[PDB]
Design a protein around this ligand. Structure first.
Ligand SMILES: Nc1ncnc2c1ncn2[C@@H]1O[C@H](COP(=O)(O)OP(=O)(O)CP(=O)(O)O)[C@@H](O)[C@H]1O
Ligand SMILES: Nc1ncnc2c1ncn2[C@@H]1O[C@H](COP(=O)(O)OP(=O)(O)CP(=O)(O)O)[C@@H](O)[C@H]1O
Ligand code: NA
Ligand code: NA
Ligand code: NA
Ligand code: NA
Lengths: 310, 317
């Protein structure tokens, strides 16, 4: 039985590495290009799977080469594709990513078949959703479809992990009240609250705003600074540091973090939040030490044993 | 069997996203359409020549990857010889990632990739094709030393050299001028190359004379809707070749269409005046600007007035 069900996105990542970002009108040269398997949903599901979770990926890709390749990718990662659909009416989603090694990126998503995943497609997955431990959603599919997946999870007492990524300033208030765990990064927290986040302290203040919108637990990820967490029971923010490492490629680190979190909510439900986050930070930091997104996500066998004890 | 037009240059996969706004640093935005297209100045030029009826050969390097295989098939679908289209496991096929807003402004990230690995040994194996051609066409999207060597090879074999210094760099090796029988660039490229402003046919004439005196035999500056301006060592007074008003849908790649047409005329209509060649090339590029999508807008002979293929002088097409 799948313990972690992800209802969300698969994208073909078209990645260019550059030393600067381009400005309007401008052509710049990068030094490398590669294709990867991406999408926040799938990335999260892949990390959870590699840690040993039994997972199911509920998603929609194209009846195109990239979509066929995506399905094979999911199978190679031991992820159930029972509810991975293909449509001839849109192409597999695409994420064009420019990664500037000398600062912030730019991403352009054409979500394609992701946006055709509908409430009828979820209904077929109703038995899987209700027998799971954790349901994970993001904002790369139609928001109404994520909302329904959260609602279905809540009705069966399944823990909801929501990642509001990429963030929308006017997010439906139900996303907060249907989230047991609400996890976003610094720039997303800014978009969602209108506040500036330049410090662990600032993140704590943004997290409290989100908490008061009805989340049970809020986590803001902070790159090399780890994360900050608070909850309804314990509303004082805690700053959990991460492993000090030399980052090669941080792309998708957040997804690694969230997939780890899903794994621990599902298989180690009695751990303190602070423990789970220490472990999830450790995992995500392993991902930043290598190139790519999914190809840098570690397997259980390569990770210290203490990450799997209780 | 023998190719009359050999292009030594670039092939790039165009990865195009249409959005309502461009992203600022740090931003993720949604676009509303994505598509894959065949670009690279070298291949674009080769394609236009081929569609006009040239026997062409594309000397280039792509990846041993799916985009590279697709590129090869594109060249074959256009009846271009791919004998010296190389594939390498050491880099991916060149890419141009293009984000375009609603008003038509863009940001572009090029990863030239396998294009840069086309080397002088690769050209040496293509020596028989280079040396037996009528025209050799190069640009500045591969390693400059490779294009220089292509030009040197073509010159010593009596093959006419058509050089397009695109994209332009300010400090171009002087040999690019002295090896060029026909040196053809656009207004913004001319400005980069000379520091002069080109806001008029007269201005273009002045920039062209600076380029001439660096040792080119013929200099052409393209001027978008204003046609082109040309001069030569034998006729150093610049001439303005205007073009009739058309309704432009998408000008992307018009310069490549122009250059590919010119290569076709140099190779297959050598007795036409240069000004006739350039008048016909203007017409052909202008057809390209009336339709979307770069190589897909490049016309075939069957789509063109027959007066473009007359062996004697003909002005109005
Ligand atoms: N430089 C670094 N060193 C160690 N860990 C890091 C790191 N950057 C990120 N991480 C880890 O990954 C988590 C996710 O961080 P964050 O959400 O900032 O990533 P992201 O996916 O937004 C990065 P990118 O913008 O490059 O895709 C952090 O909480 C931390 O555990
Ligand atoms: N609006 C228009 N109407 C008619 N012909 C046009 C045109 N725009 C371009 N052309 C034709 O295409 C040729 C090349 O145009 P241009 O000078 O724009 O080069 P280019 O395509 O390299 C500019 P860029 O590198 O900005 O895209 C012109 O000389 C002309 O023959
Ligand atoms: Na994230
Ligand atoms: Na990584
Ligand atoms: Na051009
Ligand atoms: Na066009």
């Amino acid at each position: 039985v799948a313990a972690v069900v992800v209802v969300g996105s698969c994208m073909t990542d078209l990645v260019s590495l550059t030393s600067r970002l381009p400005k309007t009108g401008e052509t710049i040269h990068g030094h490398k290009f590669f294709i990867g398997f991406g999408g926040k949903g799938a990335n999260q599901c892949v990390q959870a799977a590699r840690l040993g979770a039994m997972t199911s990926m509920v998603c929609k890709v194209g009846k195109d080469s990239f979509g066929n390749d995506y399905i094979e990718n999911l199978k190679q990662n031991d992820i159930s594709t029972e509810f991975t659909y293909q449509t001839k009416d849109a192409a597999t989603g695409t994420a064009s990513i420019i990664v500037n090694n000398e600062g912030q990126n730019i991403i352009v998503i054409v979500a394609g078949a992701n946006l055709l995943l509908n409430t009828e497609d979820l209904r077929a997955a109703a038995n899987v959703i209700s027998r799971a431990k954790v349901m994970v959603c993001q904002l790369e599919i139609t928001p109404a479809t994520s909302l329904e997946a959260l609602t279905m999870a809540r009705r069966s007492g399944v823990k909801t992990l929501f990642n509001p990524a990429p963030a929308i300033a006017d997010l439906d208030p139900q996303f907060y009240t249907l989230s047991d765990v609400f996890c976003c990064n610094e720039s997303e927290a800014e978009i969602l609250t209108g506040l500036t986040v330049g410090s662990a302290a600032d993140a704590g203040e943004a997290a409290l705003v989100l908490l008061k919108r009805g989340c049970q637990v809020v986590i803001i990820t902070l790159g090399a600074e780890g994360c900050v967490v608070l909850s309804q029971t314990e509303p004082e923010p805690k700053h959990i540091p991460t492993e000090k490492v030399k980052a090669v490629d941080t792309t998708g680190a957040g997804d690694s973090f969230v997939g780890a979190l899903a794994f621990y909510l599902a298989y180690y439900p009695n751990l303190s939040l602070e423990d789970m986050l220490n472990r999830s930070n450790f995992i995500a930091a392993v991902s930043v030490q290598a190139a790519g997104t999914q190809s840098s996500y570690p397997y259980k066998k390569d990770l210290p044993l203490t990450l799997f004890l209780e």
